[PDB]
């Protein structure tokens, strides 16, 4: 792939509908713990262990403890120069009648915090709940999400499980339900929301420029959004610290932290 910023800029100057696919590398730059790698653990598990239907079915209290800790740490995390360059790009181009949409795998909402309005969160959000009984989804920013989780979630190895009884975990407040809430986060092995995927497909079909930023490009189906785009001949530019298996399928590859490359690319 090419590494010509000048050539990318020539495409960027002309594009009227830009799709920006963002992955955990954008969150990593804000110091947000991903628990994916390389040895990133919460006390004795990683995200592969706890972000699963299995985990929630065996030990919903431990899963909530994990997500509680992640909700709490967000209070000390802020968007980085990558988030901000993306948000400013959307607002600036919007004035010119040009569309910028962010499709993010990230659940930390930092794109929103930076000001992005046109955002598809394909894996959910740490700050939404879903009721396991009625299915209602709701925004929830409360610290702590429930009284039993106050002071819990500590990440140090050896920390005892809170072992909160399921009736003291977050419960649905819909009249007559009272069911157990889960984080509204897509877990490994679960299907993504068809309506969101319908929106994703509409943007991919109409864009004339596509950026893939901070993404390892092995998690499906998100690792197959950009190939469909390049097939129509639209340029795909990758911003990542390392080549991925999907690198040689892109028009541009700009190595380095996306907070360093994006402000120049989107200026
Ligand atoms: N600071 C960064 N700037 C751009 N890309 C990054 C940065 N840090 C990590 N990356 C890349 O982000 C990707 C992380 O992938 P992963 O942890 O699987 O999350 P995702 O499933 O969202 O891709 C890897 O390609 C990693 O090299
Ligand atoms: Zn309910």
Point out the catalytic residue in the list 123, 184, 206, 253. Answer: 123
Three-state secondary structure along 217-240? CCCCCCCCCHHHHHHCCCCEEEEE
CB 17 within 8 A of CB 229: no
Question: Pick from 226, 212, 215, 220: which is nearest to 262 by CA?
Answer: 212
Q: How far is CA 193 from CA 13, 65, 109, 237, in A?
A: 33, 25, 18, 26
Point out the ligand nearest to the CA of residue 179. 2
- 3-state DSSP call for residue 40? coil
1-32+78-123+192-267 placed in CATH 3.30.70.20 = no
CATH architecture of structural domain 33-76+124-185? 2-Layer Sandwich (3.30)
Residue with CA at minimum distance from ligand 1 atom 24: 216
Residue 22 alpha carbon, nearest atom of ligand 1: 22
Nearest ligand (C-alpha, residue 81): 1
Angstrom CA distances, 44 to 48, 119, 167, 175, 224, stand at 12, 33, 25, 38, 32
* Expt. technique: X-ray
Domains 1-32+78-123+192-267 and 33-76+124-185 share a fold: no
Query: How many other C-beta atoms lie within 10 A of the C-beta of residue 14?
Result: 10
Nearest CA to ligand 1 atom 5: 214
Domain residue ranges of the chain, discontinuous segments joined by +: 1-32+78-123+192-267, 33-76+124-185
Nearest in space to 180 (alpha carbons), one of 61, 51, 69, 48? 61
Known catalytic membership, residue 206: no
Q: Which value in Å is the resolution of this experimental model?
A: 1.8
Q: Which residues pair with 119 in a beta bridge?
A: 102
How far apart are alpha carbons 180 and 116 in whole angstroms? 31
Cα–Cα distance for residue pair 242/229, rounded to 1 Å: 21
């Amino acid at each position: 792939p090419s590494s010509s910023m000048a050539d990318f800029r020539k495409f960027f100057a002309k594009a009227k509908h830009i799709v920006i696919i963002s992955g955990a590398g954008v969150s990593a730059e804000s110091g947000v713990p991903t628990f994916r790698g390389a040895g990133g653990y919460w006390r004795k598990w990683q995200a592969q262990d706890l972000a699963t239907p299995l985990a929630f079915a065996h030990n919903p209290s431990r899963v909530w403890e994990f997500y509680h800790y992640r909700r709490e740490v967000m209070g000390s995390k802020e968007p980085n120069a990558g988030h901000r360059a993306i948000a400013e790009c959307e607002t600036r181009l919007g004035k010119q009648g040009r569309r910028v949409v962010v499709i993010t795998q990230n659940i930390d909402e930092l794109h929103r915090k930076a000001g992005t309005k046109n955002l598809l969160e394909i894996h959910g959000s740490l700050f939404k709940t879903r009721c396991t009984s009625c299915g209602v989804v709701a925004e929830n920013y409360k610290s702590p999400i429930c009284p039993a989780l106050s002071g819990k979630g500590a990440p140090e190895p050896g920390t005892q499980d809170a072992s909160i009884p399921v009736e003291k975990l977050p419960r649905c407040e819909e009249a007559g339900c009272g069911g157990l809430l889960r984080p509204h986060v897509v877990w490994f092995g679960e299907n993504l929301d068809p309506a969101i995927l319908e929106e994703v497909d509409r943007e991919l079909a109409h864009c004339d420029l596509c950026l893939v930023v901070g993404t390892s490009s092995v998690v499906y189906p998100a690792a197959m959004f950009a190939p469909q785009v390049a097939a129509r001949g639209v340029p795909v530019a990758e911003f990542n610290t390392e080549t991925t298996p999907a690198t040689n399928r892109f028009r541009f590859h700009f190595q380095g932290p996306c907070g360093t490359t994006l402000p120049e690319a989107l200026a």
